[PDB]
Short mmCIF file of C-alpha atoms in Angstrom, two decimals:
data_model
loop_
_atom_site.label_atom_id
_atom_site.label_comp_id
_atom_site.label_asym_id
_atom_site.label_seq_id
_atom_site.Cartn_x
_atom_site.Cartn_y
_atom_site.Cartn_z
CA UNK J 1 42.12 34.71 18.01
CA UNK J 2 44.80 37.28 18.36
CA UNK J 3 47.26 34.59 19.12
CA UNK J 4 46.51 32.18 15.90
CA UNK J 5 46.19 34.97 13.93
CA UNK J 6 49.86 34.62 12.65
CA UNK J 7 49.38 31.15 11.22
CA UNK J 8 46.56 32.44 9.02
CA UNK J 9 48.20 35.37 7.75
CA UNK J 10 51.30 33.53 6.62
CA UNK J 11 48.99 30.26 5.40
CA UNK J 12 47.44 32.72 2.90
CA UNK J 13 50.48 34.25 1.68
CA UNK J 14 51.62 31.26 1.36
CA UNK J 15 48.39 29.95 -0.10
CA UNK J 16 48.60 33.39 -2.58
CA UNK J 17 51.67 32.36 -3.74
CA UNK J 18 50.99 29.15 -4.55
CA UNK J 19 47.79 30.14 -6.37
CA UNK J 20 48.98 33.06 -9.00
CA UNK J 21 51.23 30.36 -10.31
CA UNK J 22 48.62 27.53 -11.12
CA UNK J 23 45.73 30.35 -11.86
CA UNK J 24 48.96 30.52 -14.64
CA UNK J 25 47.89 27.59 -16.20
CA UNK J 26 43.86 28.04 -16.67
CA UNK J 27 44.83 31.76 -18.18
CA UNK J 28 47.33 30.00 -21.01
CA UNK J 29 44.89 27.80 -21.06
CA UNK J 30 42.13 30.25 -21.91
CA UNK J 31 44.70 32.55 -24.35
CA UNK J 32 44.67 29.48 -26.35
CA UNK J 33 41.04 28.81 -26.62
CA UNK J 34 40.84 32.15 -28.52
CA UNK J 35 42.43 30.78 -31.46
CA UNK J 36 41.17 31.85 -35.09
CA UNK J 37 38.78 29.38 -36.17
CA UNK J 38 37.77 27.64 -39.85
CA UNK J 39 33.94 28.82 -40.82
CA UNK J 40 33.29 25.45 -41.54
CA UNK J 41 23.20 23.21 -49.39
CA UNK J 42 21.92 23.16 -53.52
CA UNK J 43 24.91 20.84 -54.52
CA UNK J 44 24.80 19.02 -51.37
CA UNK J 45 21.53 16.68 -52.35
CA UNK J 46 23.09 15.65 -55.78
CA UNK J 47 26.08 12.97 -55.02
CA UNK J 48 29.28 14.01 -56.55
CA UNK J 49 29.97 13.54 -60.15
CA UNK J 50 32.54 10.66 -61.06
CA UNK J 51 33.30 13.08 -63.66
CA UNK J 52 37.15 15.15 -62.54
CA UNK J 53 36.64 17.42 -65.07
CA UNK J 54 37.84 20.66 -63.28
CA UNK J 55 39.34 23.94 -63.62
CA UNK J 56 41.09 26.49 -62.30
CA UNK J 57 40.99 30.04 -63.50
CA UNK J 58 43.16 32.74 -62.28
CA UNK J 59 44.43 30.92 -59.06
CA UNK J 60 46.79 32.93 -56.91
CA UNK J 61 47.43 31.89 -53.18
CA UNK J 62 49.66 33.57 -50.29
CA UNK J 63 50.38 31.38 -46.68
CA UNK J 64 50.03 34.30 -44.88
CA UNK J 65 47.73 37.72 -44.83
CA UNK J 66 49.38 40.36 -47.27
CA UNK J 67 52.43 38.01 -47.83
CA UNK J 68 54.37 37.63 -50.69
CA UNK J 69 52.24 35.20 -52.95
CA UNK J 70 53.08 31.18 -53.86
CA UNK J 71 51.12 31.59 -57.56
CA UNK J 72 50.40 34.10 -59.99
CA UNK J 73 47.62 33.41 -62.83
CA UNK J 74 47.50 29.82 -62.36
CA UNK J 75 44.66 28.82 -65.13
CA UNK J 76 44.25 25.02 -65.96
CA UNK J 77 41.86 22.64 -67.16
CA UNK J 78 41.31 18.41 -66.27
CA UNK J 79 39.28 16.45 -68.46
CA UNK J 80 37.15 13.13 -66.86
CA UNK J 81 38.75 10.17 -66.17
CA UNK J 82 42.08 11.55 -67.36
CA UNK J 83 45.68 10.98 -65.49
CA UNK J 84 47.33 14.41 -64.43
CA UNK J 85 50.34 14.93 -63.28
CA UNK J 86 52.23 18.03 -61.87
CA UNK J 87 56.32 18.21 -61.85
CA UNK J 88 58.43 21.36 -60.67
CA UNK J 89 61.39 21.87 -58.22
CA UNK J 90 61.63 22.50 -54.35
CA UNK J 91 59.22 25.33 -53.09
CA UNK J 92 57.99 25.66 -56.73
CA UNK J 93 53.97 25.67 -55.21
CA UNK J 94 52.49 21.91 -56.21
CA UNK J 95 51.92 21.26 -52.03
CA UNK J 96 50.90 24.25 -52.17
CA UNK J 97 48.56 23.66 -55.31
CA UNK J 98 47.15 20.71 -53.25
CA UNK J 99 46.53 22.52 -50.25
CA UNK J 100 44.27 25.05 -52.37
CA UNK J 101 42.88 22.17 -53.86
CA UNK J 102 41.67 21.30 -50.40
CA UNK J 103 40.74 24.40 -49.20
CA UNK J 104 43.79 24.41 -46.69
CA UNK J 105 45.35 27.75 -47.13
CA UNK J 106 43.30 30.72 -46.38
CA UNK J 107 44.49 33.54 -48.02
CA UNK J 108 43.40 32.19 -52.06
CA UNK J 109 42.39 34.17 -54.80
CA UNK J 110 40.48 33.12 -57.89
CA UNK J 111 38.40 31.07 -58.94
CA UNK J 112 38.79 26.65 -58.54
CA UNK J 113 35.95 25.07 -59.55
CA UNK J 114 35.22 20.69 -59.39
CA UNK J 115 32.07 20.36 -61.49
CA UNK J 116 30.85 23.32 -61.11
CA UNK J 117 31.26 23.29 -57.77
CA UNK J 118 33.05 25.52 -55.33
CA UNK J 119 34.32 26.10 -51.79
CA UNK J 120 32.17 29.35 -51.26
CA UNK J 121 28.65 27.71 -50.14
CA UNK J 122 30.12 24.21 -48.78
CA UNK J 123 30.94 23.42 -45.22
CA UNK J 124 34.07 21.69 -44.21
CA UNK J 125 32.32 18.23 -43.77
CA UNK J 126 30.81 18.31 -46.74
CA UNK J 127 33.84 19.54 -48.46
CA UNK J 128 36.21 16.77 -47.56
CA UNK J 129 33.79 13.77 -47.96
CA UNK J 130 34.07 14.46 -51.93
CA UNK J 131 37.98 14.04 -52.48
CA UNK J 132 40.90 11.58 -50.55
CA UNK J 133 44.10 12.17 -50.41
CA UNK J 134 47.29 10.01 -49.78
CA UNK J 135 50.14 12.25 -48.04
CA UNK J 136 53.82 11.91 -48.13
CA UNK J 137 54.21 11.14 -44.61
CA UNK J 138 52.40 7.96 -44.05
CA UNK J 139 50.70 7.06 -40.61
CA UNK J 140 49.09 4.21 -38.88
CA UNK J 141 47.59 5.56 -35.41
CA UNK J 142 47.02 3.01 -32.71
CA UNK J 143 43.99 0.92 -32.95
CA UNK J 144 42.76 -2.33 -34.92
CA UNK J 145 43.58 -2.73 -38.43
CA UNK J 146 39.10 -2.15 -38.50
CA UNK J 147 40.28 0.97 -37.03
CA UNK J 148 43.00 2.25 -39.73
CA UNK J 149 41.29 1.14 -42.70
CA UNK J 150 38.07 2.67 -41.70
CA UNK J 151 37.80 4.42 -38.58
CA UNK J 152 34.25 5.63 -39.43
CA UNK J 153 33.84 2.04 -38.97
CA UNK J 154 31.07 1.66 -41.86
CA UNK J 155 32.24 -0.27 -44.08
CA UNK J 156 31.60 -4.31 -43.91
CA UNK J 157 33.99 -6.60 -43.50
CA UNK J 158 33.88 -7.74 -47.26
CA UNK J 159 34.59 -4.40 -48.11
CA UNK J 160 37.56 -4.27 -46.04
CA UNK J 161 39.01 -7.32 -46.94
CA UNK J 162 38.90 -6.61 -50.49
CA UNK J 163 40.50 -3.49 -50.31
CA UNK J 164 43.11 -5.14 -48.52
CA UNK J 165 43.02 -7.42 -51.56
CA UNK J 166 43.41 -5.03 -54.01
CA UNK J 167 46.14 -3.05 -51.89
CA UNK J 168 48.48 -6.27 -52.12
CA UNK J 169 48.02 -6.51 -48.35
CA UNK J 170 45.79 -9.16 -47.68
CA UNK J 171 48.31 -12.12 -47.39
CA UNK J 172 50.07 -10.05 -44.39
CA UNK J 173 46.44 -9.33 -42.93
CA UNK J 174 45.71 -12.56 -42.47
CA UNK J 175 48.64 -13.62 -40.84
CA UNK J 176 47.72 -11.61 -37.74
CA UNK J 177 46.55 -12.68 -34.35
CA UNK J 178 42.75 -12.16 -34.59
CA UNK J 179 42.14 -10.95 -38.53
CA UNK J 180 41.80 -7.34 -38.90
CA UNK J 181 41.90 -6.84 -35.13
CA UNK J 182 45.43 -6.68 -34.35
CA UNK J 183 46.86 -4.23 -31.87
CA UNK J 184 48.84 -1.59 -34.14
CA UNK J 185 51.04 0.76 -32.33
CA UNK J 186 51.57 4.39 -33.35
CA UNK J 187 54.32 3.78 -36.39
CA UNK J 188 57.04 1.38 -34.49
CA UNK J 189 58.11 -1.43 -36.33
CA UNK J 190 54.91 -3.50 -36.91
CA UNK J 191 54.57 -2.72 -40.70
CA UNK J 192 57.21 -1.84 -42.99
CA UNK J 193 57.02 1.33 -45.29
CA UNK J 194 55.81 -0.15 -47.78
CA UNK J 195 53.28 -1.56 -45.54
CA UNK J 196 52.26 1.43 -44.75
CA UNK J 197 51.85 3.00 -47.93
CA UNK J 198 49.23 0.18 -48.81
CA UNK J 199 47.70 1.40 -46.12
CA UNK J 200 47.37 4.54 -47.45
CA UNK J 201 45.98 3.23 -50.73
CA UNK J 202 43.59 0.75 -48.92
CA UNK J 203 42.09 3.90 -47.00
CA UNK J 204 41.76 5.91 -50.74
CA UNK J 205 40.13 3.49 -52.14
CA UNK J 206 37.11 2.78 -48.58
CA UNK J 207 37.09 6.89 -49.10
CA UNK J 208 35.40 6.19 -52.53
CA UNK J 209 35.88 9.63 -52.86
CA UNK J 210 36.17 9.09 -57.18
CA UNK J 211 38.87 11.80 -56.94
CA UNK J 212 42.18 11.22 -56.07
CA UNK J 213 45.42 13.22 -55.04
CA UNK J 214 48.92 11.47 -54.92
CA UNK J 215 50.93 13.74 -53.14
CA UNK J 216 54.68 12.51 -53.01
CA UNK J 217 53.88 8.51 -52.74
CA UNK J 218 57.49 7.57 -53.75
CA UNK J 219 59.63 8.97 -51.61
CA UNK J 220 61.23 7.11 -48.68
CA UNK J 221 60.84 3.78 -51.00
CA UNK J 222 62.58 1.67 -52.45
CA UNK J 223 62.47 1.36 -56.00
CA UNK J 224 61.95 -2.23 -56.04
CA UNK J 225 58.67 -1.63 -54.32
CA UNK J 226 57.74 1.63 -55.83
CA UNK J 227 57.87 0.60 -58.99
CA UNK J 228 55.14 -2.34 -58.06
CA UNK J 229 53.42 0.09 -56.09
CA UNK J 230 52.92 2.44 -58.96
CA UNK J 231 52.28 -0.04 -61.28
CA UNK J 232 49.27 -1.59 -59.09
CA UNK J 233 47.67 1.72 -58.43
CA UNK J 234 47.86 2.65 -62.06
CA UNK J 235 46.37 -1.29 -62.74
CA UNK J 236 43.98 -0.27 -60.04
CA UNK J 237 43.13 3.39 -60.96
CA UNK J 238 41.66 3.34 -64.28
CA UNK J 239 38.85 5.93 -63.57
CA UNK J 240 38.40 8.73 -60.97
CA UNK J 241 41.22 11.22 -62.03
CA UNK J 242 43.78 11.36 -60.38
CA UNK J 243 46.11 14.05 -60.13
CA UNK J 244 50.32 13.21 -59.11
CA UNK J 245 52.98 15.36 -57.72
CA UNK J 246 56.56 13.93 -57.29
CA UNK J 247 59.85 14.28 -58.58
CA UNK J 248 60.42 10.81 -60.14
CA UNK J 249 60.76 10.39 -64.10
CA UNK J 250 58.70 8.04 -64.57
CA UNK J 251 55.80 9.07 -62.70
CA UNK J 252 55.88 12.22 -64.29
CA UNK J 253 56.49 10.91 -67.62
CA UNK J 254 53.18 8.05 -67.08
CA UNK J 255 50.85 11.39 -66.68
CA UNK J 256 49.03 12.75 -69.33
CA UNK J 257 48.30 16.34 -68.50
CA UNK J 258 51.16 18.30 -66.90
CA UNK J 259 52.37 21.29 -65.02
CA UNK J 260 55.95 23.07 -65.56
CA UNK J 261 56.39 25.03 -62.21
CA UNK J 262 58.06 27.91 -62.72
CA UNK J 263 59.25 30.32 -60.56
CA UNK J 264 55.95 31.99 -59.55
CA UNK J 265 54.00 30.67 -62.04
CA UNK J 266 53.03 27.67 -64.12
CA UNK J 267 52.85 26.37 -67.39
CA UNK J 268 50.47 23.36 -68.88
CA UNK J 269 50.46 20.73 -71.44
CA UNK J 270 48.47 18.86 -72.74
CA UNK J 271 49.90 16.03 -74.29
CA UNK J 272 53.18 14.06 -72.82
CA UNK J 273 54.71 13.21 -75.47
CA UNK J 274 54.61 16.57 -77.37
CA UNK J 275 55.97 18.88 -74.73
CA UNK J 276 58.64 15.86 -73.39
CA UNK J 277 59.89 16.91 -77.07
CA UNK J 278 59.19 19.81 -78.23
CA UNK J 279 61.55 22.20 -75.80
CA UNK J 280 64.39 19.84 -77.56
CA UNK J 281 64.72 18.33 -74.00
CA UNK J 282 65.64 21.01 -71.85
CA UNK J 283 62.71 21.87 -69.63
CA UNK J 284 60.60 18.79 -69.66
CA UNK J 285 63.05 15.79 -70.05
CA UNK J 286 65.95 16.42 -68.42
CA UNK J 287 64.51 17.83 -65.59
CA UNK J 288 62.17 15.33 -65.18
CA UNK N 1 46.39 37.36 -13.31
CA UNK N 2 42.78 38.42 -12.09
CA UNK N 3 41.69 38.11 -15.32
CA UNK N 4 42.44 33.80 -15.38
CA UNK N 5 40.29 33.98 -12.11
CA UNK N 6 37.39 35.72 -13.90
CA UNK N 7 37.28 32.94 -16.51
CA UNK N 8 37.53 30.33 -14.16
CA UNK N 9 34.85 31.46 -11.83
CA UNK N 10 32.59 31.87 -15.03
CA UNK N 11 33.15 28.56 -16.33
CA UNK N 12 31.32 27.29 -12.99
CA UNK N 13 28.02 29.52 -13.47
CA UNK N 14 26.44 31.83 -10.82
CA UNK N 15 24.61 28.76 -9.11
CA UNK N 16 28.04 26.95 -8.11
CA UNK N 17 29.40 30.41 -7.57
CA UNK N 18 27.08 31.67 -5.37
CA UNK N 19 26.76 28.22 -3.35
CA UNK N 20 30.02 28.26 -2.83
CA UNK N 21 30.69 32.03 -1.59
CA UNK N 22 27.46 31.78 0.43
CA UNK N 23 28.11 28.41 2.02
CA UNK N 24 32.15 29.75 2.63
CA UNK N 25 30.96 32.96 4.39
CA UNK N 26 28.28 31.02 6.72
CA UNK N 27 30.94 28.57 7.51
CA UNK N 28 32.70 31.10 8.72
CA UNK N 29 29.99 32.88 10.50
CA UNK N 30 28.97 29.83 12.32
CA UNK N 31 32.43 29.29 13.27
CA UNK N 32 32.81 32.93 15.41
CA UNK N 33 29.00 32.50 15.97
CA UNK N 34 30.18 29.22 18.21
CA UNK N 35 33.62 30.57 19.73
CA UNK N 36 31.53 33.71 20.71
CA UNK N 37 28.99 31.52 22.11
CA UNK N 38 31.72 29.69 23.86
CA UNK N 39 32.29 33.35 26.16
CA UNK N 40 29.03 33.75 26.94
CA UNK N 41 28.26 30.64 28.07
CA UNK N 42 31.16 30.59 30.62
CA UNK N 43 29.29 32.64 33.21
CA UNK N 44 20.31 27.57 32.77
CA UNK N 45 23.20 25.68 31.89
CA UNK N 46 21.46 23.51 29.76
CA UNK N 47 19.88 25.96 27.67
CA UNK N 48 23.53 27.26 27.22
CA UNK N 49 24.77 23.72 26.34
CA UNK N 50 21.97 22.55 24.28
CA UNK N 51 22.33 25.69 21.79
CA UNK N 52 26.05 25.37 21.90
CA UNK N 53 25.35 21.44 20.24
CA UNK N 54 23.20 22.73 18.23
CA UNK N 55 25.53 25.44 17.20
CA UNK N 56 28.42 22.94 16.32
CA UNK N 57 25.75 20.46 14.37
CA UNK N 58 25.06 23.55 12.15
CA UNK N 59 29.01 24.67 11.93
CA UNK N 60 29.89 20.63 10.58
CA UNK N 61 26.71 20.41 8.01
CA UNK N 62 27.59 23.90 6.73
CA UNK N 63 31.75 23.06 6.62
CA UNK N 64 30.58 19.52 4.90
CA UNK N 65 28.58 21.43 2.25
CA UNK N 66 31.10 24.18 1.46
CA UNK N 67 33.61 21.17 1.02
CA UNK N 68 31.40 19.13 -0.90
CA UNK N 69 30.66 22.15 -2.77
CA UNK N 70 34.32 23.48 -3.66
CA UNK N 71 35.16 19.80 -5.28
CA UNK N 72 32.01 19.77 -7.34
CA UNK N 73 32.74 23.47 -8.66
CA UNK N 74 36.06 22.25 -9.61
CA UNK N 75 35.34 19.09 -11.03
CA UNK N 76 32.04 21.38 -13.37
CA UNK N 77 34.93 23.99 -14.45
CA UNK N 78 37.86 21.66 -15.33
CA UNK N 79 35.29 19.38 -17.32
CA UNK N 80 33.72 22.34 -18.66
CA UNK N 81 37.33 24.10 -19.97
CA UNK N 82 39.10 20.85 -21.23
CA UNK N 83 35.55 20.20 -23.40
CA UNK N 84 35.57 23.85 -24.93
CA UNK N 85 39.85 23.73 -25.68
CA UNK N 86 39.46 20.13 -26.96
CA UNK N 87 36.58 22.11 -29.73
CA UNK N 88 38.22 25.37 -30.66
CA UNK N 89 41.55 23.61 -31.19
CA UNK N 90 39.60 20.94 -33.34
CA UNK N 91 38.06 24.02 -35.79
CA UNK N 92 41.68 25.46 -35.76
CA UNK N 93 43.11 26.11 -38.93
CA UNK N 94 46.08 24.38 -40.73
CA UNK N 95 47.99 27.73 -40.89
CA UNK N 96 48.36 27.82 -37.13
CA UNK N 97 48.76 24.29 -36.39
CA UNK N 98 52.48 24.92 -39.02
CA UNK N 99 53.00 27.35 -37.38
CA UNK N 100 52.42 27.23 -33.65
CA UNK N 101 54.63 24.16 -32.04
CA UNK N 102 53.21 20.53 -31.23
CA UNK N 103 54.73 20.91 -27.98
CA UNK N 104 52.85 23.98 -26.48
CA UNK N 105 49.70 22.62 -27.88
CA UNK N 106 50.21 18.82 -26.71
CA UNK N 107 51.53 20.87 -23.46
CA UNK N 108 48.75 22.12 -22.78
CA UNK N 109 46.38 19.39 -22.51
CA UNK N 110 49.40 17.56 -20.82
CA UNK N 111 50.48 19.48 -17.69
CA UNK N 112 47.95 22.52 -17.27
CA UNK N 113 44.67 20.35 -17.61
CA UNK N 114 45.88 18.14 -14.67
CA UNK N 115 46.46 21.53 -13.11
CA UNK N 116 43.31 22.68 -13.52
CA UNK N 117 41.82 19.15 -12.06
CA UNK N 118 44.24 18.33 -9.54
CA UNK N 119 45.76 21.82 -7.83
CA UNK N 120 43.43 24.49 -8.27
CA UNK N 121 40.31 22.53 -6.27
CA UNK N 122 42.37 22.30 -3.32
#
């Protein structure tokens, strides 16, 4: 024993050695399990009102805890079934007006309310199931096309189909390998861009959600497609609100209701056509 | 980085735990419990041999079962830790998913989960 005991002793410094530095791993591994977490029913029973008549009174929001704030008294009303859109510069807060819409940024004062409805006795589940949302970065994760269009996977195949119908993609669809079955790839080069923004409108219209939110759906097209793609979700989108955000003039001259950003604040109007004229063209046209 | 062992060694439970520090220490009990029995059966020879056999049949079934044991115990914790970081990444917030890098986060399910079920067992 005396005479093997060298080959243990330098077998388990060795072995020590080797095990602070992968014992490493499962302690990162545990410093990030203890990040924060979201705390994710009287309104829940009654099935959300087709009516987008909202508001949003006093509205302030910060990104961070006791950071300087992205609004200040942002107070604004939507009536039902009306178009709304929002217009304003880099940084001027309308992703960030979107994010607050969805309960994204947690450091929000004030009060938003969607039919009398608010984020203070609603879980997170229950919270996104009532609005959609089409970003400006479109994406079309691996899968079946069953798969990207619904990956709930409720939805019949008649459904499907005619949202692929009324998405102007249903030609394309059917000349795949299979019929909405073939094997996507995580962006590549199996759909173009504007491919992929139908996409995005075929899923906002399975959501059903009778509220939508347009965030930036022009950029990175070409205006020989955007202006079709507008044109067919306007021909498409005659109820459920919905409420735009981009820097085109057209799209913000199409909206009814909209939103000067200013600085740190923001400024409504009602109608178009009275504030695209009554600054003499200085605030509203030109920069639009 | 005794505390990473502590939260290891409680992801298993006190039943895996304890079967494997028992089983270890037995093992190795039975293993200077034979080499001692080895010295005095030098100098009823075949009492001597037949508890020596009998000695060695206990040392393999206990080695087998602290073996056995050690790969289970790893195989409970890693599926036990990559479930749990999987769930408290998915109720993470937005704010720290802008902030904190895709890389560390993809990074860690990449390389330090097939630590945790590939070197640590062993």
């Amino acid at each position: 024993y005396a005479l093997m005991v060298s080959n243990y002793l330098n077998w388990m410094v060795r072995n020590l050695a080797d095990m602070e530095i992968q014992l490493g791993a499962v302690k990162r591994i545990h410093a990030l399990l203890k990040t924060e977490a979201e705390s994710y029913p009287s309104l829940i029973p009654k099935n959300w009102p087709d009516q987008g008549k909202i508001q949003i009174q006093n509205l302030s929001v910060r990104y961070d805890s006791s950071l300087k704030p992205v609004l200040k008294h942002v107070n604004a009303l939507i009536s039902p079934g009306q178009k709304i859109g929002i217009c304003g510069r880099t940084g001027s807060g309308k992703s960030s007006f979107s994010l607050a819409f969805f309960r994204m940024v947690d450091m929000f004062e004030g009060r938003i309310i969607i039919d009398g409805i608010d984020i203070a006795k609603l879980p997170l589940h229950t919270l996104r199931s009532r609005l959609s949302i089409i970003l400006q970065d479109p994406v079309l994760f691996s899968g079946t096309i069953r798969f990207n269009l619904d990956p709930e996977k409720k939805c019949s195949d008649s459904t499907l189909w005619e949202a692929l119908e009324i998405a102007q993609l249903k030609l394309v669809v059917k000349a795949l390998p299979g019929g909405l079955d073939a094997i996507i790839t995580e962006g590549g080069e199996n759909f173009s861009q504007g491919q992929r923004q139908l996409f995005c409108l075929a899923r906002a219209f399975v959501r059903k959600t009778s509220i939508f939110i347009m965030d930036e759906a022009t950029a990175s097209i070409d205006m020989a497609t955007e202006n079709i793609l507008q044109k067919v979700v306007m021909t498409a989108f005659a109820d459920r609100t919905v409420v735009t955000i981009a820097h085109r003039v057209h799209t913000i001259l199409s909206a009814d209701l909209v939103m000067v950003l200013k600085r740190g604040a923001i400024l409504e109007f009602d109608k178009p056509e009275t504030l695209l004229s009554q600054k003499d063209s200085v605030f509203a046209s030109f920069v639009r | 980085p005794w505390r990473a062992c502590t939260k290891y060694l409680s992801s298993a439970g006190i039943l895996l735990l304890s079967l494997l520090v028992f089983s270890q220490l037995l093992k190795h009990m039975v293993l200077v419990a034979i080499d001692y029995w080895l010295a005095k059966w030098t100098d009823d020879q075949s009492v001597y041999a037949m508890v020596f056999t009998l000695l060695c049949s206990l040392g393999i079934v206990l080695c087998l079962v602290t073996s056995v044991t050690v790969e289970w115990t790893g195989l409970k914790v890693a599926k036990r830790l990559h479930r749990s970081l999987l769930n408290r990444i998915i109720l993470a917030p937005m704010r720290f998913f802008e902030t904190t890098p895709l890389g560390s986060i993809l990074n860690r399910f990449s390389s330090d989960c097939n630590t945790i079920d590939q070197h640590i067992p062993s």
